[PDB]
Design a protein around this ligand. Structure first.
Ligand SMILES: [Cl-]
Ligand SMILES: [Cl-]
Ligand SMILES: [K+]
Length: 164
């Protein structure tokens, strides 16, 4: 298991434009195109992203390319954030992957706001961190996925992704 396999499990793979859990146009392995209700708009972002006139469908390779870029961007976002960096630097590899996971899903800024959870994680108070993480809109809207991520932060193991 690794961050790529983990997020591939959590985001799935679709080669045609579709709507994510929040109703937003996305494609590939969780690549958000736009929050706009305009499909044309989404298509325009997709074409710009891929570099060709696609008509809303991409290949697996293309999808993987954006995914690699998105994972890298999540990492970069953590490293550049004053609140996330220290947390990430203080964690082991498995837990670091959990944090990357949340940032890919919600963006640097959104995760940076989980002040209290961040502090518990920095303190290595696993169970407390897990409880706190669950008190969120994130957990309520995507509970199965959140449970997986939280279990990963709680145990420092990939047990939640095992068998998937
Ligand atoms: Cl992009
Ligand atoms: Cl879910
Ligand atoms: K998805």
């Amino acid at each position: 298991m690794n961050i790529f396999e983990m997020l591939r499990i959590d985001e799935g793979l679709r080669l045609k434009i579709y709507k994510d859990t929040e109703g937003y146009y996305t494609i590939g392995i969780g690549h958000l195109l736009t929050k706009s209700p305009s499909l044309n708009a989404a298509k325009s972002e997709l074409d710009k992203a891929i570099g060709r006139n696609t008509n809303g469908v991409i290949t697996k390779d293309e999808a993987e390319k954006l995914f690699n870029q998105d994972v890298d961007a999540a990492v970069r976002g953590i490293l550049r954030n004053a609140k996330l960096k220290p947390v990430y630097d203080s964690l082991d590899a498995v837990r670091r992957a959990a944090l990357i996971n949340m940032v890919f899903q919600m963006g640097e800024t959104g995760v940076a706001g989980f002040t209290n959870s961040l502090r518990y994680l920095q303190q290595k108070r696993w169970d407390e961190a897990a409880v706190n993480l669950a008190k969120s809109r994130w957990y309520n809207q995507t509970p199965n996925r959140a449970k997986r991520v939280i279990t990963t932060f709680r145990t420092g193991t990939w047990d939640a992704y095992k068998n998937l």
